[PDB]
Symmetry: C5
C-alpha cells in the first residue's frame, strides 16, 4: 500500500522524490521511487532491526533472473550493485510478481 | 533456414517470435532489435541492453536471462584463432565490477556480427 | 513543528560561520558550506561540492581526519537500526572504489532523519 | 602502418560511422586509434595461438603512466588503468617504439 | 624541481595541444604537476635519476581524498588520494614547512571544479 508507505518514508525522502511502485519479496520490501530503489529489510539474530538500503538506479550495473525446472519452477533474482562483487540475491517465491519486478527493474535501470 | 540466413540479411533467430516471447520482461519503451545463436544460447540486443539467455545443466532446463545495460559496458574483447580449430572467447567488462563476464564463442558462431553489434550499441 | 524537531536540530547543530572561517584554507574559492551535523564521533560537513567527514583517528586518537567525499562518489547507502537497545542508527556509505562501507553511528536525540534526507538530496541530486 | 589498408581489414568489426585515425605497431601489439575507441590488438608471443582484439572506449581510460624499463632504462612500459579495474593493462614499448607519440595520442583522446 | 618553465621543456613532447602547466608541488619523492587537463606525477629515481615515471591522472579520475594530521611530532600529516581504476590510494606525506594547506586547496579546485 503506497499511502501508508509514503507516510512512513516521507521524512527521509528528498523534497521532489516520489514513491512510484512497491513489491513485497520474501523477507524484503522493494520500494521504487523516482530516484532510487529502497530495500526495506528485517535484520538481526531475531527480527528487531530494520534496514533501509538506498540504491540509486545508476548503481544497478547488471541484473539477472534465473529459473530452474519446467513445472513449479524456482526463480531467483540477482542484482549487481556497482563496486560490490557479490550480487543481491532474492528468491522470486511462489507468491512474488516474477514478471512485474523484472519489468520494473528494467524500466528504472535502463531508463 | 540457415542458408536463408546466409544469402542476405535474414536473421538466423526468428526475431518476431522471440519478441513475442520476451515481451513480458521488456520495458514498454524497449524494442528487440537483433539476436544471435551460440549453440543453444542467445545473445539478444534490445534498444537498451544485451540480454544473454543461457540454458544450463544436463537437461538445459535451468535458464538464465542476464541483462547488461549498454551504458554499463565499459570495454570488451574477443580473443580468437579465426578458423583454426579453437573456439573464441568474449569478455565484457561492466561498470563498477572487477571481473569480466566471459562467454565462449563456439566455432561457427557469428563472432564478427556479435562484435560489430556490440560496437554499435556500446560506443553509440 | 513536531515536539522534538527543534531539539533534534539543535543537538547536532554546528555554527557554520565559525566552521567556514576555520575550513576556508582548504575549500575551493567557489565552495560554500551548506549544512553540518555534529554526530557522536563525526562531523559531517555538507558543502556545495562534497561531504567532508571529520573525525579523530590514530592509535591514541591524536590525529584529525578530513575526508573529502565528492557527492558523485557516493555509490549507495544504507541506514539500519543500531545499539543494544535499538534506539540508534548505523549509516553505511559506499564510496566508489571501496567494497567495504564507511560505517558511522548516528544517535537518537540528534537529527538522524535530517541527515538521511540531506544524503538523499546530494547523492541523488 | 598503411592506415587505408588497416581500415579495410578491420572494417568487419568497425561501425559504419567509425573512422580509423592513427595506428602504432609494436612487436606483439598494434594500437589502433579510431574516432570511438582504442582497439588494442595483441597477436601474442611465441606460444600464442590466438589474437586478442580489445576495444577500449576512450572514456574507459581513467589514468595512465609511462615509465622507463629494461636494462639501463632504455625501454618504456605503458600502464593503462581502465574503468572498473584494480590493476592496469601493462604493455612494453621497446626502444624504437614511438613512445612519445603513443603518449601524446593517448593524452589527446583520453583528456578532453 | 618546481620551475614551471623547466617542467614545460621536459614535458612538452607528451603534452596535449592546448594543455598548459599551471602549478607544481615538490613532495618527498615525486612532483605533483597540475596542468589544465591532468595531474601528472613525476618520479625520478635512483642516484642517477635515470628511472623516470610520468603518471597522468585526469581530474575526473580523482574519486575521493583524505588528509590526516600528524598527531605526534615523529609523524607527518598525510594525504591519501583515491583514483578511479586503481584500488590502493596514492599516499603522500605533507612535510612541515611545505605548502600543506595550499595543495589541499588546489586538489579541491581541480577535482571538484
Amino acid at each position: 500500500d503506497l499511502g501508508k508507505l509514503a507516510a512512513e518514508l516521507s521524512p527521509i525522502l528528498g523534497d521532489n522524490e516520489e514513491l512510484q511502485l512497491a513489491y513485497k519479496m520474501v523477507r524484503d520490501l522493494f520500494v521504487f521511487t523516482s530516484k532510487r530503489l529502497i530495500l526495506i529489510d528485517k535484520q538481526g539474530v531475531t527480527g528487531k532491526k530494520v534496514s533501509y538500503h538506498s540504491i540509486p538506479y545508476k548503481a544497478i550495473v547488471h541484473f539477472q533472473v534465473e529459473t530452474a525446472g519446467t513445472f513449479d519452477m524456482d526463480a531467483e533474482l540477482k542484482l549487481w550493485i556497482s563496486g560490490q562483487h557479490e550480487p543481491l540475491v532474492k528468491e522470486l517465491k511462489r507468491g512474488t510478481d516474477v514478471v512485474g519486478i523484472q519489468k520494473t527493474i528494467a524500466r528504472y535501470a535502463l531508463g
